[PDB]
RNA sequence: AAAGUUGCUGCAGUUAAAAAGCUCGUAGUUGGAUCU
RNA sequence: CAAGACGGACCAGAGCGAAAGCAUUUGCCAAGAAUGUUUUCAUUAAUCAAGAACGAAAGUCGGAGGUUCGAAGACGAUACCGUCGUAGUUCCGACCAUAAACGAUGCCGACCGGCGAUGCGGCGGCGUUAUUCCCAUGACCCGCCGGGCAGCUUCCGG
């Protein structure tokens, strides 16, 4: 209190804050490569997806929508981007 | 047979079984109960008063501070331990007793510290309390010289030294189990069951930990592997700017629902 | 007069020069003889009001005289004293003592063009007491004091030649109204102005400066 | 204090700190004292960072060295667990001690037998010593304090973050503050440790003293 | 403060608070002025010099005084930057 | 004029006179940032 | 056995609703806040004169039913109380639009101290449980974020 650099907050405090209440607002989500166990293709999937993303070659269910982050099925691998 | 002040408080009339009844003056002149004072003038005076030698009192003090039971017991307890050690020394050869007490072993459990095991009036599954057992229920009940100690600290240090301790009944004690208070901040134990603040750190941080000792000089002491006891839930609240009744109201955390038209003082 | 405080011991000797270096360090004054030695040759006294309050007990209502007085040297110092005593002369005497204990500096400023000695409040200030609000506004030279009589007395004692005054609340309560204008003068002093923007160079404290004197 | 390679923490210092249980605090936290906590361990005890309280001890020592006269420094403790300790703290430098019940009006009522005018105040326990902090907020008196985590910081200028409930921790920290003020005051040097053992400042229970002389 | 002739027409100048730049009043009996001594950089000896900080009564009453003193000591280099 | 007891400057509406039982709603009043 | 009534305990510093208000199970119908969102549109908004919708209880018109209670009333004692008891209390369809209809406290927006409890949603994590469950999930534990109901503390200021 009464002495804190509002221009340079600590990064853990910026990650702690609400996504709109940061100094420059930014999303908490990400895009990710998903590799189906029955194949080896790459699918670009939003972390907070609301639709059932299907495999382009296997036509299998990749993620299940939830209230928050999407639930990937068991057996498929994922890797974050950027 | 060394008579402790607890034996005088419990009206333990064991002058017939033992003949070497000796004790110190301040353990009998500090009793504040008038019935014990009245009973002291009726009993025959076979009791003798003496003071232990400084060397033996000192060595009692070093292994009392080695065994960790140092702050729990008082100066009169030191005098009683010194007198019974001297009586054992000038009756029996001193090679029987030992020093460098054994390190304590760790053996945890999932039971809660406030589980009422070995309380006579309850029933865990039989377990019944008759009027014939009221005289029997005193403590955990299982040659020339013995001790009439009652508090667990003196019995603990005597069984750590291997000295045979006696009770109000005829037979001796083989196992002695009780509860002590252990600090989880500065790791110091206290056997005083009524204290609430710690000795070294000084916080209100003592918790119930069980102990059990045997005749051989082996001690094992049980924690509780229950996360209910060790959590800082109701421990932080804002304070206002600056007896046993109403005890359960304090054990509630302040940050909780009380009724809207009731008030905490 | 014997001194019982360290500041009293300092003012008993000719080690501390004026009242302004007591006021600079905001030290509490607990003896009226300090200001009697400093500026008591030019103080002027006046009683504002006397009211008997009654405390009823089984032997009747005991009568307690609240005396309202105010003092000042007409040059920049003013104090207001209230004391509840048992009779009249003790009440006015102890009220004089308390008004001596509560003497504050008075910052005086200009209205415009800054020629001669300062004559007005430096800025529009407001004092509060109870529901009573008193506002002091700078005035040109020769305006005099446009006030109620109680602020007339207080502002003449403070040395303020010219002032406009407004008042809100139960001004018929004399104690609250006198305390409101006293608060207003204290706030004339405690206001921050761009001429007080220079960085403060710090001076040795009189207790720290005269420490060999307190050793002996 | 300043990264000058002579006033830093030593291995003996941290060893004796962890031996005396100073670093562990209470179960409450006041939000003005968040910068002295390292972290919150899951047991429920706030630990106090050792370098922070080292620097705060050095700042308090620098504040207490700066007074040339050791006689006008008040050192007060109401709880018995520091009481005799502050008496020996007087034997450190000559700062006047007040142990036991504090007389109201000691700092503010000049017509008293016990009327003192110190220049710094050092306080063992802010919760037990609420009256001397209240009176120090009336006479322009600065304040050093030994503050636990569950301690308010009102009118406290240097709060030493330490366990002050236990006798060993408070006696040790009084001994350490005395050693620092005597080290850079001019009495002792840095090449040799102070001959006074830390256990000398420790408060002793009467139950401890009735069986201390038994082991002679 | 000053008239147009350049003369100093004022009783005295008050001390401004080192924490919040507030004017410390003449009847602010909770305000402090504190002296902190420095040491020699090679031997840690009190060399007689000092540094002065004044804190008004409002900052002390808020409980935010030691934070202000620590920040000022950081500004003057008394407390090390490895804090 | 006092009356800041008609209040734009400039009043009030828990307990003293005083906020509609609640919501929607045209008129009227007010309306984010941005272009050398 | 039947008749109508009413949903105890659980039931709270709880939840939902615009308010009045809402508590037996299951099924159907259409709404809804908060949350999550690297969706879409791009100022579409705030407040209310006129105007409109709902609005406890009592009361009024018409149909049905009247278990209990019960204004008025008839008895007995002494305005109080007891026995009996009409309208009403209940359901359906229209009127009425009033309450201490309360936070005796407009609505929207911004700033201004702390704490930890709780309801919901989201996120992260040692760990314990579905008789050392053989990965996930529900139940707990710790911590964070958002909107809430609601407390304690403070010389923020008023
Ligand atoms: Zn401890």
Residue numbers in the entry:
A (entry chain b): 2 to 83
B (entry chain y): 7 to 131, 206 to 222, 230 to 329, 390 to 412
C (entry chain C): 60 to 275
D (entry chain A): 2 to 217
E (entry chain V): 1 to 83
Show me the paper's own sentences about this structure.
Biogenesis of the small ribosomal subunit in eukaryotes starts in the nucleolus with the formation of a 90S precursor and ends in the cytoplasm. After dissociation of all 90S factors, the 40S body adopts a close-to-mature conformation, whereas the 3' major domain, later forming the 40S head, remains entirely immature. By combining yeast and human structures, we uncovered 16 different pre-40S assembly intermediates, most of which represent the long-sought nucleoplasmic pre-40S ribosome.
According to the sequential recruitment of the uS2–uS5–eS21 ribosomal protein cluster and NOB1, we identified two more new sub-states, RRP12-A2 and RRP12-A3, respectively. In addition to providing a near complete model for AFs BUD23, TRMT112, TSR1, BYSL, NOB1, LTV1 and RRP12, we could newly assign the positions of CK1 and SLX9 in state RRP12-A.
